[PDB]
DNA sequence: CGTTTTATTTTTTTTTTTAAA
């Protein structure tokens, strides 16, 4: 046999994995120790291993992968038997990693049998759909025990004979029950966005995966796949893989300290200087958009949108909620989309996409009418991929008179059912949104109601609790801050404002505040009645449509700002500043 | 199977001997209650079953269906032995279970086949209620009449829209009911079931396209309604 | 020197198109 080359590559395989691997000890026995529950069979081994000790015999391994992988699966079993109390019931799952190596364009006939690394997105997917892959039978006569491999796509129930010359089309029906089979799934995946060509599109490619790899995938992530391209025995092409590499152990601005968990927020020692010194807020007004200038209210307000809301402990009779409906308008040529685009870099699930293009069927799936898999898969979508995320969108303007059917659900119902030829279920909106309309000639001419300055639909301006517009003026000394900032915009030396709070330490500290859950028996919380009352003394003049849906903002903005102190036990002062800009909201 | 000897004894020593909860155990009376309502769904609770003898969890799963045979024979032999009066009318039997452990959708997999199960669902569209065939007969020349029947309806379940794993797709599974446990399915309800996992008798076993067309199918021994919106 | 061949219909969502005082 030729492939004994790879069996000796499999000897090679054993030789280092049973022997000293790393750390003065084993790398690959705690996997082995853990597999015993269902005979789990899933084990990850580094490909650098085939460099540490195999001495770059990867090219004795990395070609014959689907050829000899079976044998590598045999090696897995031969490992386990050497020390585990074992019978040969042990199966296969090998999930290589550690390949300093990374695409769709670098594909041919020639690429069979390798272990290249690729990443994609989550769309257009199919469910668990198992395969009773092994099984027993014989010909018309007698030999009723076959522990063989009936799993190759060329498999058939009737066989010829075992001990005697029998029929050649007859069959028994046999032991599909005291034996070992598999399970798998299937999807479509598109080219990454770290890789993006001109002209061409992230074309689609399709793949399966194993039990421990299964149903452990979510919306848009960056994982490391395995390059085991394989044929269709129809042909047409496919591919396959076996290994993925997509906050207790800490984020950036750390090294290991203690917390409620291992290092979930451990680095209080360095956070806390930037936690309490309330001028740190000015870092969060200044040291975050130093390349940008506008109003200073947005740049002091968005943060709590990014940060968790209320999440209280009350009823089953009705839900209480944390996040808020949101907007931003003005007219263009005012730098009113830099920021949204930046969030896609700043924050997670900052899905900057256009709203101009989307349909009312943008959100979920619509239809299938042939046995794609089961003739009814209309549970694909666009929104609920917000995994603790938000979906802010551009061009909310010329949009249709159906989107509201979802936005009506925004902060009360948050549920997802369809009046199609399928079924109805529901889901949980995790998400807030942004507003992106615009005016006709732009200026919101201050002689007619701001509602009438665009005059859009009925309930929209009930639900959206803050709008936070920047409107144009002509006082050019305003404008001469800008270009004299862009004096360092191209002039490559420190071409912005000096910072005082890195992106990564910002992003880490976001979490520390979201696990404190304040407690409000605030007497000032009882004197919000006076706050709201003097508010309505100001509302009494200038006579908008105001209610307790805006009180919800009166509550959340200050309470969640006490969260923003990384604090329980709300503090009254947050209300007054919250009062201040919100006293503009009627005057807005 | 000489093993079959002891099991029915452990039933027969159990349905008409046991007492729990300070006398007049249900098994003395449920059968007759069933018999007075002509119901054929005499129930067992696994908790009481393990209170007596938990051995019936560990010789069960090599084939729970033969366990159910070994249940129904005992029941039958109790009814017509004690109610030979009954020996006229329907004169057939099966029983129910309510292992009262909630387990969940989207977990049954490679190792949950044809074994001791306990699951829920939520109901949506399916078909009417119709019959089938039952018996081995057709020949005499050297039959499509007088060949006993058993009703049928198709299910469709759905899963909780409350306890969802956050944008994981709502899922779907094809499952069965049968004649006596029928005419209680309607759209938009949930129902807790004993449950049991298999596939079709033969779901497209052959050299085929780049993936087999296999399905996976369940029926209920017991159904206990979770919704019950009247008294 | 014998014993067997072969059929599918209605609804979706998009992009097209089309209607009344
Ligand atoms: N305060 C500011 N900070 C940074 N840039 C500014 C500021 N004011 C004006 N600008 C510049 O003015 C330009 C305005 O045109 P711009 O490209 O923003 O249109 P736009 O706002 O994207 O239009 P729309 O938002 O309707 O899509 C921006 O590119 C921006 O760089």
mmCIF file of N, CA, C and O and ligand atoms in Angstrom, chain A residues 291-294 332-338 438 482 485, ligand 1:
data_model
loop_
_atom_site.group_PDB
_atom_site.id
_atom_site.type_symbol
_atom_site.label_atom_id
_atom_site.label_comp_id
_atom_site.label_asym_id
_atom_site.label_seq_id
_atom_site.Cartn_x
_atom_site.Cartn_y
_atom_site.Cartn_z
ATOM 1 N N UNK A 291 -11.123 62.986 15.397
ATOM 2 C CA UNK A 291 -10.995 63.316 13.991
ATOM 3 C C UNK A 291 -12.242 64.001 13.453
ATOM 4 O O UNK A 291 -12.323 64.250 12.247
ATOM 5 N N UNK A 292 -13.221 64.284 14.313
ATOM 6 C CA UNK A 292 -14.547 64.701 13.896
ATOM 7 C C UNK A 292 -14.988 65.843 14.795
ATOM 8 O O UNK A 292 -14.557 65.956 15.945
ATOM 9 N N UNK A 293 -15.878 66.680 14.271
ATOM 10 C CA UNK A 293 -16.463 67.779 15.020
ATOM 11 C C UNK A 293 -17.903 67.977 14.587
ATOM 12 O O UNK A 293 -18.208 67.989 13.392
ATOM 13 N N UNK A 294 -18.774 68.162 15.573
ATOM 14 C CA UNK A 294 -20.112 68.649 15.337
ATOM 15 C C UNK A 294 -20.659 69.317 16.575
ATOM 16 O O UNK A 294 -19.924 69.970 17.320
ATOM 17 N N UNK A 332 -27.959 67.012 4.494
ATOM 18 C CA UNK A 332 -26.610 66.566 4.119
ATOM 19 C C UNK A 332 -25.697 67.741 3.820
ATOM 20 O O UNK A 332 -26.101 68.904 3.835
ATOM 21 N N UNK A 333 -24.428 67.407 3.575
ATOM 22 C CA UNK A 333 -23.336 68.369 3.581
ATOM 23 C C UNK A 333 -23.137 68.929 4.979
ATOM 24 O O UNK A 333 -22.861 70.112 5.151
ATOM 25 N N UNK A 334 -23.402 68.102 5.990
ATOM 26 C CA UNK A 334 -23.150 68.449 7.380
ATOM 27 C C UNK A 334 -22.433 67.339 8.137
ATOM 28 O O UNK A 334 -22.348 67.408 9.366
ATOM 29 N N UNK A 335 -21.928 66.317 7.443
ATOM 30 C CA UNK A 335 -21.167 65.237 8.066
ATOM 31 C C UNK A 335 -22.088 64.416 8.955
ATOM 32 O O UNK A 335 -21.790 64.159 10.119
ATOM 33 N N UNK A 336 -23.203 63.973 8.373
ATOM 34 C CA UNK A 336 -24.186 63.250 9.161
ATOM 35 C C UNK A 336 -24.271 61.797 8.710
ATOM 36 O O UNK A 336 -25.359 61.265 8.479
ATOM 37 N N UNK A 337 -23.128 61.154 8.530
ATOM 38 C CA UNK A 337 -23.111 59.711 8.291
ATOM 39 C C UNK A 337 -21.735 59.079 8.448
ATOM 40 O O UNK A 337 -21.596 57.854 8.386
ATOM 41 N N UNK A 338 -20.720 59.916 8.640
ATOM 42 C CA UNK A 338 -19.438 59.515 9.202
ATOM 43 C C UNK A 338 -19.640 58.634 10.429
ATOM 44 O O UNK A 338 -19.034 57.564 10.549
ATOM 45 N N UNK A 438 -34.809 62.623 5.821
ATOM 46 C CA UNK A 438 -34.225 63.935 5.595
ATOM 47 C C UNK A 438 -35.299 64.863 5.038
ATOM 48 O O UNK A 438 -36.343 64.393 4.576
ATOM 49 N N UNK A 482 -13.002 73.986 11.422
ATOM 50 C CA UNK A 482 -12.981 72.686 10.771
ATOM 51 C C UNK A 482 -11.704 72.560 9.964
ATOM 52 O O UNK A 482 -10.851 71.723 10.257
ATOM 53 N N UNK A 485 -8.682 72.368 11.682
ATOM 54 C CA UNK A 485 -8.398 71.032 12.200
ATOM 55 C C UNK A 485 -7.843 70.120 11.113
ATOM 56 O O UNK A 485 -6.898 69.362 11.355
HETATM 57 N N1 LIG D 1 -18.064 68.979 12.568
HETATM 58 C C1 LIG D 1 -17.570 68.274 11.523
HETATM 59 N N2 LIG D 1 -16.691 67.270 11.728
HETATM 60 C C2 LIG D 1 -16.192 66.559 10.705
HETATM 61 N N3 LIG D 1 -16.512 66.775 9.420
HETATM 62 C C3 LIG D 1 -17.375 67.756 9.065
HETATM 63 C C4 LIG D 1 -17.974 68.571 10.128
HETATM 64 N N4 LIG D 1 -18.788 69.450 9.520
HETATM 65 C C5 LIG D 1 -18.728 69.215 8.185
HETATM 66 N N5 LIG D 1 -17.881 68.209 7.909
HETATM 67 C C6 LIG D 1 -17.598 67.665 6.558
HETATM 68 O O1 LIG D 1 -18.649 68.005 5.647
HETATM 69 C C7 LIG D 1 -18.951 66.890 4.801
HETATM 70 C C8 LIG D 1 -20.442 66.764 4.555
HETATM 71 O O2 LIG D 1 -20.768 65.888 3.466
HETATM 72 P P1 LIG D 1 -21.070 64.333 3.760
HETATM 73 O O3 LIG D 1 -20.123 63.443 2.997
HETATM 74 O O4 LIG D 1 -21.173 64.243 5.233
HETATM 75 O O5 LIG D 1 -22.589 64.039 3.328
HETATM 76 P P2 LIG D 1 -23.433 63.059 4.295
HETATM 77 O O6 LIG D 1 -23.680 63.780 5.600
HETATM 78 O O7 LIG D 1 -22.838 61.675 4.291
HETATM 79 O O8 LIG D 1 -24.867 63.023 3.587
HETATM 80 P P3 LIG D 1 -25.950 62.022 4.209
HETATM 81 O O9 LIG D 1 -25.629 62.028 5.680
HETATM 82 O O10 LIG D 1 -27.277 62.629 3.841
HETATM 83 O O11 LIG D 1 -25.630 60.718 3.522
HETATM 84 C C9 LIG D 1 -18.464 65.639 5.504
HETATM 85 O O12 LIG D 1 -17.687 64.827 4.622
HETATM 86 C C10 LIG D 1 -17.620 66.145 6.652
HETATM 87 O O13 LIG D 1 -16.302 65.600 6.586
#
